[PDB]
């Protein structure tokens, strides 16, 4: 049958591409990594280079500090026994301070002081990484869309681990670092607030979450369907519309009575996705601060 | 109640956003037209956005959208009905005329440039250091059409240099001239390359390019359009 | 009406059924045979839902609900007022979705593009048929399917899930969840990447895909590429739905206890089941 352009038939390699320079301090750019032929069947085969300035090493360092701080506590929960460490890997958990300690930093290390330590490293790593997404786009003269979208995910994470614990008066409200334990946190958060299915911002979050899989299915399928006219060369189809962009628009117009442009679809995309965590963070933030039971609230407000 | 205020606010913001997004997606193909090319009476409830202007790199100019809109080419079709909404029959050969699934757009008759100002796409022979690195190398394989006859032989690959991917196969025909086939429209097999969109006899009609070492956006659209149109238009006579 | 560039593409041909008979548009909408099918099925189903609404006794979107036949009915018909309406509406809905996808195929053939879109849509259709058809039939009753109502089908998600405890512990559901969240992440990045290149700093020139590759390599040391990101978005999305359908096809059939207990096969492995320490020793 016909070729579907899901997997490359013939990979070609040339000299390692070191990238645009613009205003980038090339001293902080690494050298290219190896070439993964495996990756090459789906996307690009070239790994690297990576930029790693000071903000970069800072972020990377505190990230592992966050991670090792958890894994240290996981080993101690395993009594340093490698066999139980793997056996119970999904059951270990680094829990926040008990409600007693409020918003203070007085809790002992094996009772949430360590949670606060790892949280601090996480705070540093994420926010520095955010700065990286702005700065790397600035160095290249590009818009700040990536950092602006990233802020929307940061919103929810900030609400879950920082803003909402503070507004509720204790660190005990925050999410624990652990595989099964934070799943339990999630389930119990819903039960305690009268079923998040009744949180209207939670419902919106789902609509955008589902919607993102819908839109990216539609979009990804459309571009593949017109990649026989260069459809994936989207920036040049924006600058000088081709038969690829016209067939794409007309598929949807004929199907559902309206359509996008090659640029506009990407505005639908960025908003569909960022609204997931935007509504999400609002709905968590309101929970227990303003609304204690979403069923109850739903009886009075709709 | 604060949550009620937040959710009411959000629904208002979401309506403004959808309105914004819809207008943003009217910077091509609008105003709507009747089948005869004139402005349609009913344009829908969304207005055209204020124009924006893209600064193209490499002195290539600008693009301002929405702007005056012309096909900038004749269109060999005619009405098949006395009222709106029916198909329009090709007045000639639809693959020769570039209509239907064989359609092409009058894109700029220059090639696409990379970030350094060089041509995005080159035949591999003229691309320093570029080689086949995985999968079957098609160069040298016979090319078979959907009528199961050999139409030519692969003589090079045309590669996207900044993205390092194959984009066309350059195929040589019986008369010694070449054509470009879109990479996405061939099947590289072990003993051949198979093209299901075209029969062997339609290969000579693939639009040719003017320079043997570059291809223009306009030429790509004629090649891609032509080959894709074979799916509907070759199928009758051959298969 | 037509877009500026539309008329050259409105040629005859592409249909799978009926030849030229339904080969025409209505405004922007293409019709075809499967446009008529879709209209018939959709209109029937909607009428039945409005009828099932009078039998229930409300014209309120937040209260209209259409429940399947109770478990007592097994896999057989039921009186319309008590789940026959749901059954026939399900047939309409399957009819309209499958018609819509086949109508998309015909649009694909007229336009000379690949079939990736209705193929992708068919994954959503099969998730639906998993909940309303495949899983019910494997379980012996239409009553295990979800009702058609805005809030009542949410209650069904909650009641079905809590039947197995916290449903998070369904391991296929864990994979599906990961694909959904990865997909959204890819969607935000992709949208923001193309726009940051098409809309650079004030007065600057429109950046290139080269800039897009450079940006991500600078950031994470890799760039999947402009063809790859579209392969990826499609693959994450369809995998999310596949593992969605899979996580429910196995629930109440091959596994029907608390999903949290499924994980004991790991911890009760012989080489470490009985070592003291940890959370389970
Ligand atoms: C409760 C409800 C609350 C809802 C929350 C809504 C949040 C809205 C965020 C708006 C961002 C606006 C960005 C902007 O300036 O626009 C330029 C932009 C121009 O095009 P461009 O390509 O984006 O420009 C690139 C530049 O040329 C090149 O420049 P650049 O790329 O360097 O600049 C990036 C630019 C462009 O960036 C974007 O396109 C943004 C896309 C991602 C959205 C990011 C939002 C994430 C924020 C999370 C914060 C969580 C807080 C929780 C609350 O972003 C900005 O200019 C600054 C934005 C500042 C807003 C952030 C505030 C944080 C405090 O146009 C828009 O983005 C329009 C946005 C649509 C808004 C719809 C408004 C509806 C109003 C309702 C009234 C309806 C009444 C009738 C009913
Ligand atoms: C998918 C896994 C679960 C399930 C779990 C949930 C959960 C959990 C939630 C929803 C939510 C919603 N679900 Mg549900 N839902 C299921 C199956 C369905 C089916 C179906 C035929 O299979 C449909 C039509 C819907 C439809 C809906 C909407 C009412 C709402 C937002 C969806 C959305 O944005 O999606 C992404 C799609 C788009 C953005 C495209 C537009 C889709 C539009 C909005 C659908 C309109 C449906 C219309 C009201 C149905 C009647 C149609 C007429 C009779 C013709 N669900 C199954 C059982 N669904 C949320 C809500 O708030 O509910 C009150 C919510 O929190
Ligand atoms: C029993 C469980 C409860 C319930 C309890 C909750 C709770 C509690 C929450 C959700 C949340 C969400 N739920 Mg719910 N949920 C239920 C039922 C459902 C159903 C369903 C089928 O019924 C669905 C589809 C969903 C779906 C969703 C999402 C729409 C939403 C999360 C958005 C998101 O992407 O967050 C994920 C995105 C983030 C967390 C942001 C991450 C950003 C940071 C900056 C990233 C840091 C990375 C770090 C440094 C590590 C790096 C590693 C790298 C490898 C280097 N829920 C039931 C009723 N749900 C959230 C929400 O918003 O609710 C309103 C939430 O907090
Ligand atoms: C709706 C909005 C969506 C969205 C949006 C956006 N999200 C973005 C951006 C945007 C727009 C970016 O611009 C940015 C980025 O750059 O993207 C490539 C980012 C990011 N979103 C991440 C994770 C994430 N987003 C989630 C959610 C959504 N986001 C939602 C759905 C979720 C969950 C839980 O759902 C998760 C886990 C990171 C990949 C990254 C932050 C890195 C960081 O802050 O690092 C700081 C940390 C480090 C530098 C190092 C940490 C050490 C690790 C643990 C490694 C140890 C390795 C070990 C030795 C080897 C094995 C590996 C093994 C553990 C596996
Ligand atoms: C597989 C990966 C994703 C995926 C993919 C794709 N999705 C596509 C396509 C692709 C690729 C298309 O090509 C196609 C389309 O054109 O897009 C614009 C489509 C579409 N996806 C829709 C809904 C959608 N996708 C969801 C999920 C994903 N999508 C997943 C995540 C979800 C949820 C819940 O998550 C929803 C609600 C419609 C907008 C549209 C079909 C219209 C239709 O078929 O019209 C024909 C039918 C009608 C006009 C109405 C029929 C009415 C019946 C007979 C009476 C009602 C019966 C019903 C059971 C009642 C339910 C009540 C409710 C409260 C429970
Ligand atoms: C690069 O390319 C791309 C484009 O193009 C340039 C695009 O446009 C699109 C398309 C994407 C968009 C336009 C973005 C917005 C889309 C979403 C957020 C997805 C949600 C979609 C909807 C909510 C619309 C749903 C509407 C439907 C399903 C049709 C409505 C149906 C009717 C009112 C009539 C139905 C017609 C029938 C019954 C068939 C026959 C017709 C008769 C009248 C008979 C994509 C993906 C793309 O990647
Ligand atoms: C203009 O274009 C553009 C390009 O080009 C110029 C680009 O390059 C890119 C750049 C894009 C990238 C480099 C990739 C960006 C996306 C990501 C970083 C996310 C992608 C990650 C993957 C696809 C691989 C990982 C996917 C996962 C984890 C889903 C699979 C899940 C599992 C199978 C396991 C998960 C479940 C667990 C762990 C529970 C255990 C399960 C048991 C049963 C036990 C973009 C955005 C772009 O826009
Ligand atoms: C082999 O073992 C070694 C030792 C090598 C290892 O290192 C193994 C490592 C591990 C096994 C680590 C495993 C890691 C996990 C299991 C991670 C699980 C984490 C989650 C599931 C995260 C859930 C959500 C996390 C959230 C929401 C965090 C929010 C953080 C806050 C926003 C931070 C706010 C900061 C605080 C509260 C501190 C005070 C703030 C200041 C500004 C000072
Ligand atoms: C999200 C995917 C991340 C892929 C990370 C690739 C790492 C960059 C490789 C740098 C190579 C440095 N070195 C030593 C080979 O020169
Ligand atoms: C940018 C795309 C807009 C997508 C539209 C989403 C439809 C929302 C329907 C979900 C209803 C949620 N709620 C509040 C009633 O629970
Ligand atoms: C989220 C709710 C879903 C509503 C579906 C909206 C579809 C609109 C199609 C409009 C096109 C028809 N027309 C003539 C106005 O162009
Ligand atoms: C969207 C804003 C969310 C917070 C608004 C103000 C509420 C802060 C918390 C105060 C009430 C919390 N508590 C414990 C008394 O319920
Ligand atoms: C949740 C998706 C919302 C879709 C919004 C509906 C848009 C329909 C209006 C499109 C206008 C078509 N028109 C008339 C300008 O050609
Ligand atoms: C539910 C529909 C799924 C979409 C199928 C995508 C591939 C279809 C190929 C159709 C070709 C039909 N035929 C036999 C005339 O060639
Ligand atoms: Cl925008
Ligand atoms: Fe795209
Ligand atoms: K409560
Ligand atoms: K070479």
CATH number at residue A86: 1.20.85.10
Ordered alpha helix ranges (H), A99-144: 113-139
Based on the domain organization, do A188 and A208 belong to the same domain? no
Ordered alpha helix ranges (H), A47-144: 54-77, 82-87, 113-139
Q: Which of residues 185-204 of A touch C (CB under 8 A)?
A: 186-187, 195, 197
For residue A54, count CB atoms less than 10 angstroms from its CB and return exposed for 0-12, middle for 13-18, buried for 19 or more. Answer: exposed
Q: Are C88 and A239 in contact (CB under 8 A)?
A: no
Is the shortest distance between the CB of A175 and ligand 4 below 6 Å? no
Based on the domain organization, do B19 and B137 belong to the same domain? no
Report helix, strand or coil for C222.
strand
The dihedral over CA atoms of B82, B88, B91, B92, expressed in degrees to the nearest 10, equals -170
For C185, the token pair is 């992440």
Please tell me whether the peptide bond between B66 and the residue prior to it is cis, using omega within 30 degrees of 0: yes
| Contacts of B129-133 spanning 24+ positions with Cβ under 8 A | B129/A14, B129/A15, B130/A12, B130/A13, B130/A14, B130/B159, B130/B161, B130/B164, B131/A12, B131/A13, B131/A14, B132/A10, B132/A11, B132/A12, B132/B157, B133/A11, B133/A12, B133/A13, B133/A35, B133/A37, B133/A40, B133/A45
Q: Are A170 and A251 in contact (CB under 8 A)?
A: no
For A251, the token pair is 């598929």
In a domain, A112, yes or no: yes
**Which one of B60, B90, B120 terminates a domain?**
B90
In a domain, A59, yes or no: yes
B72 in contact with C, Cβ within 8 Å = no
What's the domain range around B67?
Answer: 2-90
Please tell me whether the peptide bond between B31 and the residue prior to it is cis, using omega within 30 degrees of 0: yes
Q: What share of chain B is helix, strand, coil (3-state, %, to 5)?
A: 25, 25, 55
* Cα of A32 from ligand 9 centre, angstroms: 7
The length of chain B, given as a count of residues: 239
Report helix, strand or coil for B203.
coil
Q: B185-201 burial string, b = 16+ CB within 10 Å, else e? A: bbebeeebbbbbbbbbe
Based on the domain organization, do A176 and A233 belong to the same domain? no
CATH number at residue B69: 4.10.540.10
Report helix, strand or coil for B238.
coil
Number of CB atoms found within 10 A of residue B9's CB: 11
Instruction: Give the contacts of B180 (CB within 8 A, at least 6 positions apart).
Output: B158, B168, B169, B170, B171, B206, B209, B215, B223
Q: Are A44 and C228 in contact (CB under 8 A)?
A: yes
Is the shortest distance between the CB of A35 and ligand 8 below 6 Å? no
CB-CB under 8 Å, A255 with C188: no
Which residue's entry shows tokens 């305690």?
A192
d(CA C261, CA C4): 61
CB-CB under 8 Å, A139 with C28: no
Q: Which of residues 46-105 of A touch B (CB under 8 A)?
A: 46
How many Å lie between the alpha carbon of B78 and the closest alpha carbon of chain C? 10
Based on the domain organization, do B83 and B105 belong to the same domain? no
**Which one of B62, B90, B118 terminates a domain?**
B90
- Number of C-alpha atoms within 13 angstroms, CB side, residue C140? 4
Dihedral sign of CA atoms C207, A52, A64, A124 in order:
negative
Based on the domain organization, do B163 and B54 belong to the same domain? no
d(CA A272, CA A221): 17
Q: Are B164 and B195 in contact (CB under 8 A)?
A: no
Based on the domain organization, do B105 and B217 belong to the same domain? yes
DSSP C57-94: T---TTT--BPPPPGGGTTS---GGGTHHHHHHHHHHH
Based on the domain organization, do A90 and A111 belong to the same domain? yes
Q: Which of residues 173-192 of C touch B (CB under 8 A)?
A: none
Distance of CA A247 to the CA centre of its chain: 32
What's the domain range around A238?
Answer: 204-280
d(CA C108, CA C105): 5
Based on the domain organization, do B219 and B124 belong to the same domain? yes
Based on the domain organization, do B143 and B49 belong to the same domain? no
* Cα of B28 from ligand 13 centre, angstroms: 15
Which residue's entry shows tokens 């949410």?
C154
Based on the domain organization, do B131 and B187 belong to the same domain? yes
The structure was resolved experimentally with X-ray
d(CA A40, CA A37): 5
Resolution of the solved structure (Å) = 2.6
Task: Name the domain count of chain A.
Answer: 2
d(CA A186, CA A175): 8
In a domain, A176, yes or no: yes
A148 interaction partners in chain C (CB closer than 8 Å):
192
Q: How many interchain CB pairs under 8 A, B with C?
A: 126
In a domain, B95, yes or no: no
Give the DSSP H or E segment for B169: strand B165-172
Strands B62-65, B52-55: pairing is: antiparallel
**Which one of B67, B90, B113 terminates a domain?**
B90
Based on the domain organization, do B121 and B184 belong to the same domain? yes
- Touching chains, A (3+ CB pairs < 8 A): B, C
Based on the domain organization, do B44 and B136 belong to the same domain? no
Report helix, strand or coil for B181.
strand
Nearest beta carbon to residue C204 from set A141, A227, A235: A141
Based on the domain organization, do A166 and A272 belong to the same domain? no
Instruction: Give the contacts of C43 (CB within 8 A, at least 6 positions apart).
Output: none
Q: How far is CA A28 from CA A21, A48, A49, B126, B161, in A?
A: 12, 13, 10, 32, 25
The length of chain A, given as a count of residues: 302
For C52, the token pair is 């099932």
Q: Are C121 and C101 in contact (CB under 8 A)?
A: yes
How many Å lie between the alpha carbon of C215 and the closest alpha carbon of chain A? 7
The residues spanned by each domain of chain C are: 1-163, 164-263
Based on the domain organization, do B119 and B219 belong to the same domain? yes
Q: Are A43 and C231 in contact (CB under 8 A)?
A: yes
| Contacts of A217-220 spanning 24+ positions with Cβ under 8 A | A217/C120, A217/C121, A217/C123, A217/C124, A217/C233, A217/C234, A217/C237, A217/C238, A218/A252, A218/C117, A218/C120, A219/A265, A219/A269, A219/C230, A219/C233, A220/C116, A220/C120, A220/C230, A220/C231, A220/C232, A220/C233, A220/C234, A220/C235, A220/C237
Between C84-111 and C32-56, two packed helices, what is the crossing angle to 10 degrees? 160
How many Å lie between the alpha carbon of C9 and the closest alpha carbon of chain A? 8
Q: How far is CA B41 from CA A192, B31, B33, B38, C1, in A?
A: 57, 10, 8, 9, 8
d(CA A125, CA A127): 6
User: Comparing C-alpha atoms, which of A206, A202, A190 is closest to residue A288?
Assistant: A190
Based on the domain organization, do A139 and A255 belong to the same domain? no
């Amino acid at each position: 049958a016909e070729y579907q352009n899901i997997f490359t038939q013939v990979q070609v390699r040339g000299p390692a591409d070191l990238g645009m320079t613009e205003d980038v301090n090339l001293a902080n750019r690494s050298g290219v990594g190896p070439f993964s032929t495996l990756l090459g069947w789906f996307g690009n085969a070239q790994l690297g280079p990576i930029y790693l300035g000071s903000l970069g090493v800072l972020s990377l360092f505190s990230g592992l500090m966050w991670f090792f701080t958890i894994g240290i506590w996981f080993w101690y929960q395993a009594g340093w026994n490698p066999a139980v460490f793997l056996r119970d890997l999904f059951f270990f958990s680094l829990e926040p301070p008990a409600p007693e300690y409020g918003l203070s930093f007085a809790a002992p290390l094996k009772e949430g002081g360590l949670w606060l330590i790892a949280s601090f490293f996480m705070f540093v790593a994420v926010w520095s990484w955010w700065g990286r997404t702005y700065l790397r786009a600035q160095a290249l003269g590009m818009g700040k869309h990536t950092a602006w979208a990233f802020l929307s995910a940061i919103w929810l994470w900030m609400v879950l681990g920082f803003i909402r614990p503070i507004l509720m008066g204790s660190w005990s409200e925050a999410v624990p670092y652990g595989i099964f334990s934070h799943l339990d946190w999630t389930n119990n958060f819903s039960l305690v607030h009268g079923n998040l299915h009744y949180n209207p911002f939670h419902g919106l979050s789902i609509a955008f979450l589902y919607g993102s899989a819908l839109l990216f299915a539609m979009h990804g399928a459309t571009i593949l369907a017109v990649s026989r006219f260069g459809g994936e060369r989207e920036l040049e189809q924006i600058a000088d519309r081709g038969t690829a962009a016209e067939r794409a628009a007309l598929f949807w117009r004929w199907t559902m009575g309206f359509n996008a442009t090659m640029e506009g679809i990407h505005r639908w995309a960025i908003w569909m996705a960022v609204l997931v965590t935007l509504t999400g963070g609002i709905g968590i933030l309101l929970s227990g601060t303003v609304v204690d039971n979403w069923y109850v609230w739903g009886q009075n407000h709709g | 109640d604060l949550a009620s205020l937040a959710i009411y606010s959000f629904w208002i913001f979401l309506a403004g956003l959808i309105y914004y997004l819809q207008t943003e997606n009217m910077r091509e193909g609008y105003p709507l037209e009747n089948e005869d090319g004139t402005p349609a009476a009913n344009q829908g409830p969304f207005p055209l956005p204020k124009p924006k202007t893209f600064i193209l790199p490499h002195g290539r100019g600008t693009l301002t959208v929405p702007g005056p809109e012309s096909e900038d080419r004749p269109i060999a079709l005619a009405r098949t009905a006395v009222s709106e909404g029916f198909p329009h029959a090709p007045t000639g050969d639809p693959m020769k005329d570039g209509v239907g699934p064989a359609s092409w757009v009058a894109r700029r008759d220059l090639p696409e440039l990379d970030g350094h100002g060089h041509n995005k796409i080159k035949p591999m022979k003229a691309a320093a250091g570029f080689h086949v690195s995985a999968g079957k190398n098609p160069i040298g394989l016979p090319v078979r059409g959907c009528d199961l006859e050999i139409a030519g032989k692969v003589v090079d690959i045309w590669v996207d240099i900044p993205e390092q991917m194959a984009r066309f196969l350059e195929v040589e025909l019986k008369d010694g001239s070449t054509r470009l086939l879109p990479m996405q429209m061939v099947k590289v097999q072990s003993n051949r390359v198979h093209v299901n969109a075209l029969s062997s006899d339609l290969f000579a009609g693939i639009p040719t390019i003017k320079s043997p070492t570059e291809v223009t956006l306009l030429e790509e659209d004629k090649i891609c359009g032509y080959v894709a149109g074979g799916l509907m238009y070759a199928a009758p006579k051959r298969k | 009406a037509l877009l500026s560039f539309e008329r050259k593409y409105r040629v005859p041909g592409g249909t799978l059924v009926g030849g030229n008979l339904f080969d025409f548009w209505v405004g922007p909408f293409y019709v075809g045979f499967f446009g008529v099918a879709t209209f018939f099925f959709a209109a029937l189903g909607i009428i039945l839902i409005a009828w099932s609404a009078v039998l229930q006794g409300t014209w309120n979107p937040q209260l209209i609900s259409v429940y399947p036949p109770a478990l007592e009915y097994g896999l057989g018909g039921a009186p319309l007022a008590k789940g026959g309406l749901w059954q026939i509406i399900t047939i309409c809905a399957t009819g309209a979705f499958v018609s819509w996808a086949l109508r998309e195929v015909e649009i694909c053939r007229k336009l000379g593009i690949g079939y990736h879109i209705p193929f992708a849509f068919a994954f959503a259709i099969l998730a639906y048929l998993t909940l309303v058809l495949f899983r019910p039939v494997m379980m012996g009753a239409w009553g295990y399917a979800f009702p058609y109502g805005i809030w009542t089908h949410l209650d069904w998600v909650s009641n079905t899930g809590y039947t197995y405890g916290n449903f998070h512990y369904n391991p296929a559901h864990m994979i599906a969840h990961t694909f959904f969240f990865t997909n959204a992440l890819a969607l935000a990045l992709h949208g923001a990447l193309v726009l940051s290149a098409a809309n650079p700093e004030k007065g600057k020139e429109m950046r290139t895909p080269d800039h897009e590759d450079t940006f991500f390599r600078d950031l994470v040391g890799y760039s999947i590429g402009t063809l790859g990101i579209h392969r990826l978005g499609l693959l994450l999305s369809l995998s999310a739905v596949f593992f969605s359908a899979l996580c429910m096809i196995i629930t109440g059939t091959i596994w029907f206890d608390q999903w949290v207990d499924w994980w004991q096969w790991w911890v009760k492995l012989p080489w470490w089941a009985n070592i003291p320490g940890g959370i389970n020793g």
